[PDB]
Amino acid sequence: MMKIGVFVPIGNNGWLISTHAPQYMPTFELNKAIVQKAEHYHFDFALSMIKLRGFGGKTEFWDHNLESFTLMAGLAAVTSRIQIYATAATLTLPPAIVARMAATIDSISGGRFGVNLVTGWQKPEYEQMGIWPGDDYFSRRYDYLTEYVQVLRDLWGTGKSDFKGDFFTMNDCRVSPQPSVPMKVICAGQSDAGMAFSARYADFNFCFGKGVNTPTAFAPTAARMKQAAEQTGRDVGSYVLFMVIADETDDAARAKWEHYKAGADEEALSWLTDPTSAVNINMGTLVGSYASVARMLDEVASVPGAEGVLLTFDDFLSGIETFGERIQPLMQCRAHLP
Ligand SMILES: Cc1cc2nc3c(=O)[nH]c(=O)nc-3n(C[C@H](O)[C@H](O)[C@H](O)COP(=O)(O)O)c2cc1C
Ligand SMILES: O=c1cc[nH]c(=O)[nH]1
Incomplete structure (x- = not known):
């Protein structure tokens, strides 16, 4: 059994850098329609990233981005069951x-x-x-994040902090109310330091899916994360990011994927800098018939440490509908839904 989340398009054009991909601005109303449809199909969670600068080009790729806490506060007000995650860029x-x-x-x-x-x-x-700490931050950033989360855990646990470190000084800092339930922390650490942070302080760790139609290729990353969690004795599973490009047949889905690769916005790709493609930032991609994608997601669910997937689509509104109507009902790892 496996959890399913939607990575909501808080940035223009989602995760495709192509003139042949759907062209759309991130609005509230679009993200509301996406999360209400995801909730209708029993998605377990919705997450937004934070992206404070884009890549330009013909598609102005991620030049247009909403802010994560305010977006997710609006989505929380128009949902009732789906888990809601916002991203904090902890320097900001x-x-x-x-x-x-x-x-x-x-x-x-x-x-x-x-x-x-x-x-x-x-x-x-x-x-x-003007808020970059300097190139020392590459090496020290999980030291910074460790102090940050100690302040958060004090405030959510007791309502107060006296924490004093290299980066923060709390003098009887107060935050009430405290959350009604234990606050979930997630981390997207791929490095050794990042996974060591996740093992100590996160509920789950987000990692990248790998390759095109090689659903289990990320397995060594999920194995490293399981080894990190052993060092703390904590249950910290992997949630794996994939893009789904599904259609009625394998040939139809492949035709869409090829059509997107052919429109690659090369100018946006240079700023950024059966193989994976820069057209979706070399994301783990599942390209097939509804039944072929259901089989490939069942293979993800078998990988040691994998507890869920975070999904993007080529078209979120039609991609969530076909996921709920055609893919999810064929998944052995979703047989637990009503
Ligand atoms: C699902 C996912 C979401 C991410 N979201 C963001 C984000 O919103 N903002 C950001 O600055 N970095 C984001 N990242 C980058 C991670 O925090 C990234 O894997 C990390 O910065 C690289 O691993 P390391 O930090 O351990 O080297 C994300 C990564 C993943 C896998
Ligand atoms: O930095 C980021 C944010 C969202 N998605 C990615 O692949 N990378």
Whole structure:
């Protein structure tokens, strides 16, 4: 059995960098339609990233991005069952503010909220607003994140912090109310330091799916994460990111994938800098008939450590509908749904 989440398009054109891919702005109403349809099909969770600078080109790729906490606060108000995760770019928000924002969305959602904590990697997202700490941050960023999460855990657990470190000084810091349920923390650590952080402080770790139609190719990453979790004695599973391009036949899905690769927005791809393609940032891609994708997702569910998948689509509104109507009913790992 495996959990399914939707990675909501908080940035324009989702995860395809192509003039032949669907062209759309991230609105609230689009993300509302996506999350309500996901909830209707018993998706377990919805997550938004945070992306503070785009890649330009013909498609202005990720030049247009909403902010994650405010988006997910709006989505929490128009849902009732799906788990809601927002991403904190921890260089941009003081931990006491994230603590209070999480208590707030806990109140909006009736205990369905969690936080994805990221260090940030892309210097320009931070340099552009004068808040990059310097190139020491590449090596020290999980030290920073360790202090950050200690402040969050004090505030959510007791309502107060006296934490004092290299990066934070709390003098009887107060945040109440405390969340109604234990606050879920997720991390997207791929490095040794990142997985060591996740093993100590996260409920689950997000990793990248790998290759095109090689669903189990990420297995060594999920194995590293299981070894990290052994070092803390904590149950910290892997949720794996894939793009699904499904149709009625294998040949039809392959034709769509090829059509997207042929439109690659090369100018946007240079800023960024059966194989994976830069057209979806070399994402793990599952391309097939509804039945072929259901079989491949059942193979993901068999990989040691894999507890769920985070899904993008080529078209979210039609991709969620065909997932719910044609793919999910054939998945052995979703036989637990009503
Ligand atoms: C599903 C997923 C979501 C991510 N979201 C973001 C994000 O919103 N913002 C960001 O700066 N980095 C994000 N990242 C980058 C991770 O935090 C990334 O794997 C990490 O920065 C690289 O691993 P390392 O930090 O251990 O080297 C994401 C990664 C994954 C797998
Ligand atoms: O940095 C990011 C954010 C979302 N999706 C990715 O593949 N990378």
